[PDB]
Amino acid sequence: PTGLTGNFREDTLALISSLREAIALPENDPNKKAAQAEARKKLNDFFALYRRDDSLRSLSSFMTMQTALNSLAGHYSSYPNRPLPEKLKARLEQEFKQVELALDREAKS
Numbered sequence: 001p002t003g004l005t006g007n008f009r010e011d012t013l014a015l016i017s018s019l020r021e022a023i024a025l026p027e028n029d030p031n032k033k034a035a036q037a038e039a040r041k042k043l044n045d046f047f048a049l050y051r052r053d054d055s056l057r058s059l060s061s062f063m064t065m066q067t068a069l070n071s072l073a074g075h076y077s078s079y080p081n082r083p084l085p086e087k088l089k090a091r092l093e094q095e096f097k098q099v100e101l102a103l104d105r106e107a108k109s
Ligand SMILES: [Cl-]
Pocket: 078, 079, 080, 081, 082
């Protein structure tokens, strides 16, 4: 139902890939709105599962992903009928890259 595995690294990497795909679609793609609606659902599902785990809450990967996912959610809530500005898309992408770096640093610690 969620598609979440319960493995924080696998799920975060999969969510990053899903979000990258949704954001990369052209504004005029027929499926853009649907992909958006699914991004919202998936980020909500991800927080619903993982925010209850205070181990994960202490980690940089988690903190940065929360910053990202909040910025995405906030755009929709404030500007539901406008596209993500290029400047936000660029920031989200930097954040994703940072999450991935943090996941690898955490795994080798
Ligand atoms: Cl709007």
